[PDB]
Design a protein around this ligand. Structure first.
Ligand SMILES: NC(=O)c1ccc[n+]([C@@H]2O[C@H](COP(=O)([O-])OP(=O)(O)OC[C@H]3O[C@@H](n4cnc5c(N)ncnc54)[C@H](OP(=O)(O)O)[C@@H]3O)[C@@H](O)[C@H]2O)c1
Ligand SMILES: NC(=O)c1ccc[n+]([C@@H]2O[C@H](COP(=O)([O-])OP(=O)(O)OC[C@H]3O[C@@H](n4cnc5c(N)ncnc54)[C@H](OP(=O)(O)O)[C@@H]3O)[C@@H](O)[C@H]2O)c1
Ligand SMILES: CN(Cc1cnc2nc(N)nc(N)c2n1)c1ccc(C(=O)N[C@@H](CCC(=O)O)C(=O)O)cc1
Ligand SMILES: CN(Cc1cnc2nc(N)nc(N)c2n1)c1ccc(C(=O)N[C@@H](CCC(=O)O)C(=O)O)cc1
Lengths: 159, 159
């Protein structure tokens, strides 16, 4: 199955011009723990903000143009994206906006991180009807010496 | 010799209750690069903010109270701190504010990261007389897909 993994500030903002202005090592740790050993699908802008292959994971990048790095996999469509995954139990879609909108429909599960931050951005998570998703986990955490803002982990399953 | 390394937002703000609201991997690599194979000196607050010993370097934490982690060196005075460094060509002071303030009068060099981040914080970098320091390097960078805010690296030598 397909799962999307994302980190949302208030109002589902998930992106802007430059890197999101927050320091959340706790989020990244969760990102890793839930993506390790799986295939990762991301769009070109997300690949740029990451700038190097994610280890231990199979990296597939969506782009209408030829790729720029021999290290990872490049695909030109959603269907090639999947097919490149092979037979696998779970597929993780990691950003950005455009990719999420195309994939939200195929997804069975969501991995959200609701961050208590208000930032002005140009990219939003797509809307989703809770009355379609069943929350199967959730856990909040206050900000601290390591994480710049409060955040809460949450997992939902398509009903 | 003693050197202080620090990242400053506008008005010398260096800290607050929780981790700073920025995301600057480029700053981190500069930090790793200028600290490599050197003893690092930090205050308790900064140790808790890092969360683990920095690898391949000697960690020395200042605290008026008994240490609580066997993997790092705890000391009770600036002197003990220096003595634990031993005979080395460069000692690095990584924060926070109370620490910097003690060691600035002894520093021969400052490795500054000037960030175009305007944040609300309680802690400041001490004040330094410019006619006291020589600027021996600077390198600016615009914010990007990886770095949340613009930044400029600097290196000054005490005259
Ligand atoms: C920020 O980042 C932005 C883009 O935000 P975002 O979060 O939407 O970025 P994103 O999802 O990480 O990147 C979208 C990019 O992925 C590629 N892509 C997505 N779906 C595709 C498909 N079906 N076939 C081929 N390529 C596909 C395109 O790359 P190509 O541009 O290389 O065609 C597209 O420009 C602007 O908002 C800027 O402000
Ligand atoms: C939070 O934390 C901020 C504290 O900021 P900060 O930048 O000052 O933290 P920092 O320098 O990283 O840490 C301050 C701590 O350093 C330790 N320390 C520093 N100099 C010492 C000395 N000469 N002898 C013994 N212990 C010494 C103390 O530990 P102990 O308190 O454990 O004695 C002190 O509370 C607040 O204002 C806020 O942002
Ligand atoms: C910016 N980008 C995309 C990114 C970041 N946080 C997110 N957070 C969540 N929850 N979901 C996402 N899809 C998301 N995507 C990144 C950038 C760096 C790393 C990264 O360093 N990850 C390392 C973790 C390394 C480290 O822990 O410093 C890893 O091995 O997963 C991941 C994603
Ligand atoms: C929060 N804190 C203190 C910190 C952060 N940035 C600074 N930036 C500058 N310029 N100077 C400092 N003293 C400074 N201190 C940290 C937090 C994490 C790491 C850290 O992981 N550094 C790794 C770098 C790992 C990486 O490259 O991702 C190291 O190897 O030293 C360091 C300092």
């Amino acid at each position: 199955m397909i799962s999307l993994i994302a980190a949302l500030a208030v109002d589902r903002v998930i992106g802007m011009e430059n890197a999101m202005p927050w320091n959340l090592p706790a989020d990244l740790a969760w990102f890793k723990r839930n993506t390790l050993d799986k295939p990762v699908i991301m769009g070109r802008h997300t690949w740029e903000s990451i700038g190097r292959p994610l280890p231990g994971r199979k990296n597939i990048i969506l782009s209408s143009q030829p790729g720029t790095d021999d290290r990872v996999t490049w695909v030109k469509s959603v269907d090639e994206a999947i097919a490149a995954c092979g037979d696998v139990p779970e597929i993780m879609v990691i950003g950005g906006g455009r990719v999420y909108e195309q994939f939200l429909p195929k997804a069975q599960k969501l991995y959200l991180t609701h961050i208590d931050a208000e930032v002005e951005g140009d990219t939003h998570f797509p809307d989703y009807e809770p009355d379609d998703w069943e929350s199967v986990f959730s856990e909040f955490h206050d900000a601290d010496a390591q994480n710049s803002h409060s955040y809460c982990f949450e997992i939902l399953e398509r009903r």
